[PDB]
């Protein structure tokens, strides 16, 4: 297939280029198209016939082709431009081929996370398991460290993290960390704590609870 850098980043209002490297037999001999893919959506065409914009696509987007490479340019970057970008062309059989995609990250100012912790519901405990969730909301940059402690024992290997796509409006990320215990294990300990480290925090933030403080509504 075609080759693209895995990611690019820039601040709002700036310009970026994304370039697609191919060969004589695909880009060399054929028209190039470009597509935007917002998370969870189908690709949307930005450029076709190397440099033409479909109706509805603003002139912030431009394309060109030279030899066996092609380039997408985006000016006036907006938070809504966060997406994967793909080139596409045709091969020696005139079948469509695509690049691997380039993720565009929008830079913004450092933002510390707000941290929230959720004791497991009585409903779930009745089913035999305790999931303890720590939420880090609306932070930047994406790098963050979360450590779980249960009665001051550092947990290793029994939690899983998930991170959202970059927010289309404020360019932040959010992260969940979920610590899973059996009911019996959950009922052997008192203090459940998640400790969060992030560039935007001058010292780590800990959120904690004691088993037994809450009852379901």
């Amino acid at each position: 297939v075609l080759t693209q850098p895995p990611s690019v980043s820039a601040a709002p209002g700036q310009k970026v280029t994304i370039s697609c490297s191919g060969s004589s037999s695909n880009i060399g001999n054929n028209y190039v198209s470009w597509y935007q893919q917002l998370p969870g959506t189908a690709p949307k065409r930005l450029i076709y016939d190397n440099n033409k914009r479909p109706s509805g696509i603003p002139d912030r987007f431009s394309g060109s082709k030279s030899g066996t490479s092609a380039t997408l340019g985006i000016t006036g970057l907006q938070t809504g431009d966060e997406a994967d970008y793909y080139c596409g062309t045709w091969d020696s059989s005139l079948n469509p081929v695509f690049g691997g995609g380039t993720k565009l990250e929008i830079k913004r100012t450092v933002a510390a996370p707000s941290v929230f912790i959720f004791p497991p519901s009585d409903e779930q405990l009745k089913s035999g398991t305790a999931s303890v969730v720590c939420l880090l909301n609306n932070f930047y940059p994406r790098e963050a460290k979360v450590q779980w402690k249960v009665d001051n024992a550092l947990q290793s290997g029994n939690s899983q993290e998930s991170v959202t796509e970059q927010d289309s409006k404020d360019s932040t990320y959010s992260l969940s960390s979920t610590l899973t215990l059996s009911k019996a294990d959950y009922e052997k300990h008192k203090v459940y704590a998640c400790e969060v480290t992030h560039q935007g925090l001058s010292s780590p933030v800990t959120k904690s609870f004691n088993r037994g403080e809450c009852i379901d509504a």
Partner: protein, 223 residues
């Protein structure tokens, strides 16, 4: 013009994947092409095949012996059959087609995730992530739903039947050591709203036909 994929989410290894794409707003007999493109999780786009105006078909050479694309004019639909599937065929499958002029944008379906696996369907349990002082920061509260132990992907989550979108974060699922997926969806709201505003997460797991509307109510906490 709108395109919409339909077909099973889970397919067993060695069986045949069957998808359909229903086309509305345009005659299937008037397309420049109708075709299929897939996207494995975390990877790029791969063309599968196309059917042209006459009915002539062209398939990806690495897939050719396993692919059939056909048109049903009475249903105004086209299809994909992919035989002898393996785990490597797990992907979001898009239908696409070109209408009206050669320079037009193609129309795309929404994409449908097909998982090829020997594991079986399992619907989720839905548990509340109920707000309390522990999920309050200043005048803001966080609440959510935990959608646990389902297979295969995906699940969709909305809040308040779509009326609540601001501040919602629905996390990518994680694959647990059990081989089942879980995810959470959270939202931040004014603490002042907890006593007056109802918050319901709407969960749909199409592969198991599981739909749940869960009201998330504040906990009674004395910390």
């Amino acid at each position: 013009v709108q395109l919409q994929e339909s077909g099973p989410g889970l397919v067993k290894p060695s069986e045949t994947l069957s998808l359909t794409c229903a086309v509305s707003g345009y005659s299937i007999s008037s397309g420049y092409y109708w075709g299929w493109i897939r996207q494995p999780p975390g990877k790029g786009l791969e063309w599968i095949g196309s059917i042209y105006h006459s009915g002539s078909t062209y398939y990806n050479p690495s897939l050719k012996s396993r692919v059939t694309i056909s048109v049903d004019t009475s249903k105004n639909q086209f299809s994909l059959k992919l035989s002898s599937v393996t785990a490597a065929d797990t992907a979001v499958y898009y239908c696409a087609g070109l209408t009206q002029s050669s320079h037009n944008d193609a129309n795309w379906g929404q994409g449908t995730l097909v998982t090829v696996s020997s594991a079986s369907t399992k619907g989720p349990s839905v548990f509340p992530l109920a707000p309390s002082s522990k999920s309050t920061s200043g005048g803001t509260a966080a609440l959510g739903c935990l959608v646990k132990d389902y297979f295969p992907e995906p699940v969709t989550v909305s809040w308040n039947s779509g009326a609540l979108t601001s501040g919602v974060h629905t996390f990518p699922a994680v694959l647990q050591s059990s081989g089942l997926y879980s995810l959470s969806s959270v939202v931040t709201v004014p603490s002042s709203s907890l006593g007056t505003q109802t918050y319901i997460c709407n969960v749909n797991h199409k592969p198991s036909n599981t739909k749940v509307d869960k009201k998330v109510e504040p906990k009674s906490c004395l910390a």
